[PDB]
Amino acid sequence: TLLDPLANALSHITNSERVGKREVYIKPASKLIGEVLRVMQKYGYIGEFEFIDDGRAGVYRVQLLGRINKAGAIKPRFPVKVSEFEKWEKRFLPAFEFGILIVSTSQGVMSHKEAIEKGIGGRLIAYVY
Amino acid sequence: GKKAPNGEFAGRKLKLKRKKFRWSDIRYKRRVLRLKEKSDPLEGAPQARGIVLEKIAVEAKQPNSGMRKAVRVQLIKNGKVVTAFCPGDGAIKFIDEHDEVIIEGIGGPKGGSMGDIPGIRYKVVKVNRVSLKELVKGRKEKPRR
Amino acid sequence: KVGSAGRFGARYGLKIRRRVAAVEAKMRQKHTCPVCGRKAVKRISTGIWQCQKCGATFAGGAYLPVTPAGKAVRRITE
Amino acid sequence: MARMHARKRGKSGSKRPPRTAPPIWVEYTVEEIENLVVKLRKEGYSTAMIGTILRDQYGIPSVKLFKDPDNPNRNLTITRILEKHGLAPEIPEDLMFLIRRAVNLRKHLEQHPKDLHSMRGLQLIESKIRRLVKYYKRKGKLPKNWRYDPETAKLLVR
Amino acid sequence: MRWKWIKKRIRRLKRQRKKERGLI
RNA sequence: GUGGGGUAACGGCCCACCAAGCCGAAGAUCGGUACGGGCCGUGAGAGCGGGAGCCCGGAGAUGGACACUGAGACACGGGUCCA
RNA sequence: AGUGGUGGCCACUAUUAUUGGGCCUAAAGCGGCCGUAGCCGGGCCCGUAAGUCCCUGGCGAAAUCCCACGGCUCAACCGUGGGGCUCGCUGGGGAUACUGCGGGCCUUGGGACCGGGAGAGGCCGGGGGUACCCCCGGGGUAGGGGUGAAAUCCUAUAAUCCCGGGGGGACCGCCAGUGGCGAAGGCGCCCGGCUGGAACGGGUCCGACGGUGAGCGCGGAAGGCCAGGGGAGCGAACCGGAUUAGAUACCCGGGUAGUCCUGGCUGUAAAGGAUGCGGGCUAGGUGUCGGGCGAGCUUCGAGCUCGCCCGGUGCCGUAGGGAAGCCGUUAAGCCCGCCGCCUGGGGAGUACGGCCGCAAGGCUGAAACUUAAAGGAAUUGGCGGGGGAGCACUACAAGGGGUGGAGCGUGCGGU
RNA sequence: GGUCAGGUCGAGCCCGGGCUCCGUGAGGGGGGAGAAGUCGUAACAAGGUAACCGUAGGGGAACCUACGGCUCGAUCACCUCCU
RNA sequence: UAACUUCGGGAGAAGGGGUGCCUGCGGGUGCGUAACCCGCAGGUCGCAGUGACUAGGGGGGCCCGACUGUUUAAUAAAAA
DSSP states (O other), X not given: OOOSHHHHHHHHHHHHHHHTOSEEEESOOOHHHHHHHHHHHHHTSSOOEEEEOOSSOOEEEEEOOSOOSOEEEOSSXXXXXXXXXXXXXXXXXXXXXXXXXXXXXTTEEEOSHHHHHHTOOEEEOEEEO | OOSOOOSSSOHHXXXXXXXXXXXXXXXXXXXXXXXXXXXXXXXSOSEEEEEEEEEEEEOOOSSOOOOEEEEEEEESSSSXXXXXXXXXXXXXXXXXXXXXXXXXXXXXXXXXXXXXXXXXXXXXXXXXXXXXXXXXXXXXXXXXX | XXXXXXXXOSOSOHHHXXXXXXHHHHHHSOOOOTTTSOXXXXXXXXXXXXXXXXXXXXXXXXXXXXXXXXXXXXXXOO | OOOOSSOSSOOOOOOXXXXXXXXXXXXXXXXXXXXXXXXXXXXXXOHHHHHHHHXXXXXXXXXXSSSSSSSSSTTOSTHHHHHHHTOSOSSOHHHHHHHHHHHHHHHHHHHSOOOSHHHHHHHXXXXXXXXXXXXXXXXXXXXXXXXXXXXXXXXXHO | OHHHHHHHHHHHHXXXXXXXXXXX
C-alpha cells in the first residue's frame, strides 16, 4: 500500500527535475509537505508553491528551479542529537556547506544551520541538496 | 528496497541474516571452530620435529618435470604421518634418515601447491637443528654432509 | 498407526488388515436415508441395511445403503 | 486504484461524486427522502440497494452528501439511521453477504464433486471473513465474544 | 553428463542401504 | 501458599502440610567452549580481533570429603580421613 | 643490529555491505497462494509525554591514551596539570514537529453493492461426424509391406486391393487468430442445466478494516504407486531384421505394462517472464481483446471503422539503468515496507542424524582433501555430412595418352 | 576419654543405565594425483543420433527408448513469428 | 526398560525397591455406627515377613517354518 508518503513525494520531485519539468503535482498532502515546502522556499532552492485545499485529495503544485539535484528520506528515520548533526551531513551527503540536513524539531521542520541556532533536534526526517 | 528489515525495532532480523551468511566463508567457520587447528598436523604451531621414516621421492605433474626429494615423517610431537618437501642442491646428501628433522608449513594453508609436487604442503627447514637453507647458499655456509 | 486393525495384532499381513480396517470403519457409519431424513443406518445382514429410526429395511451394497451397480440402472433413462 | 488478491488485473477507475456543495437541483427535502428509506428497508431491500435507488429516483449525487450528518455516528449514511431505529442488525451488510456465499459454496462442492476451482474459492472467501471479523469484534460492529467459524456461519444463514 | 551424476548417486544410495540392510 | 527449623541473616536453604503451579520460540532445555573487567592489538572510521605483563574482583592450591580456633578459614608452606 | 622464514591475527577484503554489495543471463526469487507471530501504516483533531530532543546535578577507580611543560647528555619512560576514557546505570524541570497509545473524526487505501457483457474456468447429462480397428457379405489376383537402400515379416481356398452392413474404443483436422479464461499447475467437438472468477460504468455500502508475512495450511503437469473397469490405435520392457568391424544406436517387422475411466495415493520440473509481493512516480507512437462513451458507415446487427476513457496482451523507443546483450508505464527506471536467497571451483546435494513418503524419492545437510581457475557478454579468426551464392582447367566431367605388369636407366628406404 | 542406641553432614569402592569424544577392524565404496594400458566415439558444428529436463524401464561404458515439459533449439525448420 | 517394529508389539525385556505383628486415624459403600472394602502414621521382634504351602532364571546371534492349528493312537510333534 501507500506507506511512508513523504519519501514518495520527494522521489516524484526528483524524477521531475531529472527530466527538467516545470512543475509537480503531489498526490500526498500533509502539514509535513507544506512546512517542508516552506523551508525549501526560504532557501530559494524551490520557487513559488500553491496549495489547493481539496478534501477529495489535497494537491500541491510546486515550481522547480532545478537547484535540488537529489532529495530523499531516511530508511530507519533513526534519531539525531546536536553533536551528531555534522557526523550525518559529511558521512552520507556530498554536501558540506549547503546547509540543509532537514530534521524535525519541536517547532516544525528545520534545516541544519537552523537546528544549530535553536539548539534542538529530534528524529532525522530527511535530506536535501 | 528489494530486501531488508529497515524498521526501528526490526534490527534482530537483520543481525541474524548477516550472522548466518557470515558462516558461508570457510576461513571464518574454521577459525572460530578450531577446525584449522585440528586439521593441520602441527596443531596450529610454527614447527614440529619428527623422525624420518624413509626417503621417498614424488612425481611431477603434466605441465611440468622433476623428481622431488622428500621425506615421509612421523612427528615426535604427536604420532601422525606428514609428507615434507626437502630442498638442497644434490639435496639427498644433506638430508638424513632416522635423524631428527624439523618440519614447518609453507605458503599458508591455502591448500594449493606448486606444479612439480602432486600435493605437498610442507617444508623441512632443519636437519639436526642446522638449516638446509644455509647449505643451499654459498655465502653463509658452503656444502656440508 | 491403526484405524481398527490393532485388535488382530501384527498378524494377517499388513496390507489385508489395513484394507479391512478402512472398509469396516466405513461400513459401521450412518448413511443417507432418503426415507425419514433421520439416520442410523446399520447393516443387518448380507445385502441388507436397515435404519433404526423408521423401522425400514431395504436393500443395499456391501458397505453403503446404495449400490454403484444400482446407480447405472437409474442413469439410463426410459 | 489497483490491487490483486484473486485477479491478475487492476481495479476499476470509478470515483465518488464531487458535487460536495449541497444539492439544489434536487427539489425534494431531507425529510421526504428519510421517509422513503424507512419504507424501502421494510420492503425487503438491503442497505446498498436502497442507496442506489435513492441516487436514481430521488436524484441525489451520493447519499453521503445530502444526509451527513443527522445522527452523530461515523460516516453518516443509511444504516446508521436504521441502526438507531433497530431496522439494521449490528453485523455490517457487507459481512452478512460474504457469510451467505460462504454457506452456499459447501453445499455445491458436495453434490458436484471433483471441483478444484470452486474448492480454492471456498478456502479464499472464508479466510477473508476471519480477517474482517477480527477487526469488527474490536470496533464493536460485532460482539467481543463472537467468533467466526463455519458452523456459526451456517447458523446465521438459517 | 547430467544423467550420469544422478543415477550414480541413486546407485550409491541403494548399495549403501543394501549394505546397511544386510549388516546391522 | 501456611506454619516451622537452622543460620550472622533474608530464602523451598532445609522441613511438615496444603495446592498444581512455574518455564518456553524476543530460543527455554541440552551438548560444547571460555575467569570477567580497565584496557590492549588493528583500522581514517564503522568494525574486527583479544583478556598477556600490570592494576580490580571472584576461583583454585595432588583428587575428594571433614571439623576446630578465631570479627574473619571450612584454612596456599595446619590437623583428621578416604583415593 | 638487525635481515629473512614459518605459523596466527587485523588492515588491504563494500570476501559480510550500518557507513559500504547483490538475485533476466555472472552465485542468488520460494511452483503459487493463504493468513499466524513479527515488521510496517492515509488525512484531520484531541488527551498522555512512553519513544524523541534540550538543560542541570549524582557517577562511570588508578593505570593505559592524547596535548603541554619539566627531569634523566638525549629519548624511550616517569612526574605534574589539562583533556578524554568500556563509558552500558540514576533523578527532576521543559518542548510536542516526528513516533507510540487512548478517544473523536474523513473517504483518498482495503473489502463490500447494482446493471449490461465476453470467455478452451469448474462440475453433470445428452449427442454428431471424420478417421482407425474388428467382424459379415459381395467383388477381385499374386504379391503386399517396409526403406536412404534393404532384410525380417506377411500372403494363395486368397492376403493387399475395391463396395455395402453391423459392432467397439478413442478423440475432436477444419473452426483456431501474435486470440480468450483461471492464483498457480493449467484450461480447446457441439448442446442444455448447475457453479466459480474477471474487465467495466455508476463509489450505493463499512470507515483505515491496510501492506508484507518466518511458521502453518492448501493446490500441484507428466509418469509412478494401489484397486476396479475399460482396451480401438499407439507403444518402456521385450523378441527378430538391418545398419555397423560389432550396434551395443539412429531405421524396419512383431509386442507387454502403460496410454483411456473411476475411486485412492505420492509429489517432481529449464513447474521460465530463469524477472518475490503491495503502492506512488518517470517521453511517446502504433496494433489488438473486452467494457464505458460520441459518431460515421449500415446488410440496420456494434455488421465495418475512428477518437476520448478504463483494464489486459504485443511491437518500436525516451530519460535512466546494465558488463553488455538488452530493459524502458508489462522496468533490469526512481523510491518505500516486508519475506525468500547467495558470498570461488571440485569433494557433494554426498555422508551422518532426524523428519516426511507405500516405494521411487523429498527436506535438511558436513568434513578431510585439492585447485589457479570455474563463470558471463561481446570482438576477431579458423571450422562445420550448417544455410545461400559464385568462379577455377595445378579443379571435375567429356576426351586423348600414360604409371602399377616386364626389362633397363636413375634416386631414395633397407641391406 | 570408654562403649553403645537414635538422627544429620558424608568421601571411597562396587553395579547398571544415559550422554559425549578419541583410538581402532577383516572386508567394502567413491574421491583427488600419476604415467603408461584398455574398449568404444558419446558431447562440443546438426559431432553426421539437435539438446536439456522430470519420471519410468533397460543397457559393459560414454548412453538409449517411452511420456509430458523446455529451448539456454539445430534450420531458408515458409497457418504465423521466422518468410 | 534396549536392539528391532507390520506401531499392534518387543515387555513380566533388562534392572532397582517394599511387603509380618500391635496401637491410633482417613477415604469409599451403606445404615445411623450395625454390616463391609482400600490406604496412612507411631510402636516393635527375628538369621529371615510371599518366613510354611503356593511360587518365571535372564540376555543375544545364526538357520528354518510366518503366526494359532495338524501329523507317524503305541520309538519319529519336525526344517513336515
